[PDB]
Amino acid sequence: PKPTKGPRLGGSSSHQSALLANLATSLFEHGRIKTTEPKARALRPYAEKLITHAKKGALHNRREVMKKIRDKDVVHTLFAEIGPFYADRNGGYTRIIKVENRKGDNAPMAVIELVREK
Amino acid sequence: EFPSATAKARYVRVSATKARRVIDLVRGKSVEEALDILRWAPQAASEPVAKVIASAAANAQNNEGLDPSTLVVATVYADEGPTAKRIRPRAQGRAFRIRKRTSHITVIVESRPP
Amino acid sequence: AVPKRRMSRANTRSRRAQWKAEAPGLVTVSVAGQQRKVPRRLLKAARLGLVDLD
RNA sequence: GGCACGCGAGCUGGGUUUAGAACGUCGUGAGACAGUUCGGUCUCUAUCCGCCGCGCGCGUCAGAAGCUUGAGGAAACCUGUC
RNA sequence: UGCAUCCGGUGAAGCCGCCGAGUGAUCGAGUGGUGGAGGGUGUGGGAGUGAGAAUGCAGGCAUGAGUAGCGAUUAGGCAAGU
RNA sequence: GGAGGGGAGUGAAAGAGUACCUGAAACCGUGCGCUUACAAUCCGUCAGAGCCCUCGACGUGUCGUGGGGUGAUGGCGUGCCU
């Protein structure tokens, strides 16, 4: 999606890519994760586009997802439940909730979770 | 004059100015709103001040038997406590001084009519 | 550059007065029945029970 | 042409102007030469005035909001061929 | 400190004030607070007898300032627990 | 959570709490009174409006052989030592 306007998240572009991949993997595996607010803000489009790939479930899309997720159990869950679950929803798969700041460095924490309403 | 009770936290291991920065937010406010303000204040010096204010409110409610709903933070300030001297070695063999300051926090809550 | 002169009390206090903290704005919330103050930034989180409230 | 022959808490170290070495000359000698040649550490977190930008507070006799007049000031001002 | 007298747990010294006084260094056996054991006066004797500065010494604390910095060239994230 | 503190006690005194006799100055706060955002200030001194406090007299506020605090405003005014 849209690249970050400012400097990268983890201090380098490769670290940022690995960070986004790991965060997306954790979000798909658990269903909700807690992280600093900018991290979730950057994670939203990445996870939503991965879910969009998972929605139209074909071998091509499976390879497209696997070239970013790298975790096979999470890929199987994504293409078995998460994919079909959002079949009739057009966008807005995730939501961001702002929570209390961190104690060590006063970083703004936020919780990003998949929607389960319908 | 109004009935009142006081509490003191001596040798609190925070600098006096940093404690005053937090304290200046809860002058003249009631105990409950001051407690919430310090709870949601983004400073590490707010915890000791909130502890002092809670202790003063408990002292007023228990020993004098005052109603906590009428308590108001009337007088509050932070003084300077003893400071310890450390040494931070520097470039080209010189040694600088580091001061580890403390402070005393005094709070006086009083019962005021609604 | 080094300071050529010792700053007087007036200038020091006047510039020192600008180092201060602002009071965050609090709005009420109803969780588990009892009413308590929570910043409006955390209103939704408090309503979903994601904020530890002592 | 003036302004520390402007401007090194802005830069350079090519020259001059330490300690090494050589040539010519002087001195018996250590050494010396507004004589020559090769090489040779340029330190600092801006307190005050000053200047460039940006805010907070108050004032303009109630509290506000749109559109503006402008005292005053700044910018610009080159020239050729066919 | 010699000598002679006076004051003191019914509160001395020391410290902080008020009200005053002398031509000056200064004074108040005038008082209020704190304090808890030694002081005043006269006349002599002796001084480690008076600090504002020696880039003076020791201790304490200010300005700069809640500012610089928080010590490499690899990077951390999530869930759970205490 | 502790640290620390508020009651309760011991003590003649906790303005004696093992950070402890007396507790000055530098330095840092809190509360009250006056003053300060058209102003070029060796930061004081001499006049001085206003506001607040206080001592007397007479009425209900107004003077006085008064005293204090802060002081808008005007005049004057080139820190100390060697």
Curated annotation (Swiss-Prot), chain A:
Annotated protein name in UniProt: Large ribosomal subunit protein bL17
GO BP of this protein: translation
Entire protein: shown range: 2 to 119 of 199
A single GO molecular function term of this UniProt record: structural constituent of ribosome
Source organism of the structure: Mycolicibacterium smegmatis (strain ATCC 700084 / mc(2)155) (Mycobacterium smegmatis)
GO cellular component: cytosolic large ribosomal subunit
Protein keywords: Ribonucleoprotein, Ribosomal protein
Subunit structure: Part of the 50S ribosomal subunit. Contacts protein L32.
Entry's family note: Belongs to the bacterial ribosomal protein bL17 family.
Cysteines joined through disulfide linkages: none
Segments forming a coiled coil: none
UniProtKB/Swiss-Prot annotation, chain B:
Molecular-function annotations in GO: rRNA binding; structural constituent of ribosome
Any GO BP: translation
Keywords (A to Z) from UniProt: Ribonucleoprotein, Ribosomal protein, RNA-binding, rRNA-binding
Annotated disulfide bonds: none
Biological role stated in the UniProt entry: This protein binds specifically to 23S rRNA; its binding is stimulated by other ribosomal proteins, e.g. L4, L17, and L20. It is important during the early stages of 50S assembly. It makes multiple contacts with different domains of the 23S rRNA in the assembled 50S subunit and ribosome.
Quaternary state and interactors: Part of the 50S ribosomal subunit.
UniProt name for this protein: Large ribosomal subunit protein uL22
Species, as recorded: Mycolicibacterium smegmatis (strain ATCC 700084 / mc(2)155)
From Swiss-Prot, chain C:
Ranges of Basic residues composition bias in the record: 1-18
Keyword presence, Ribonucleoprotein: yes
A Gene Ontology cellular-component term: large ribosomal subunit
GO biological process: translation
Highest taxon listed in the record's lineage: Bacteria
Gene Ontology MF annotations: structural constituent of ribosome
One Pfam assignment: Ribosomal_L32p
UniProt region (Disordered), positions on chain: 1-19
Keyword ATP-binding listed: no
Keywords per UniProt: Ribonucleoprotein, Ribosomal protein
HAMAP family the UniProt entry points to: Ribosomal_bL32 (MF_00340)
Family (UniProt): Belongs to the bacterial ribosomal protein bL32 family.
Designated name of the protein: Large ribosomal subunit protein bL32
Species whose genome carries this gene: Mycolicibacterium smegmatis (strain ATCC 700084 / mc(2)155) (Mycobacterium smegmatis)
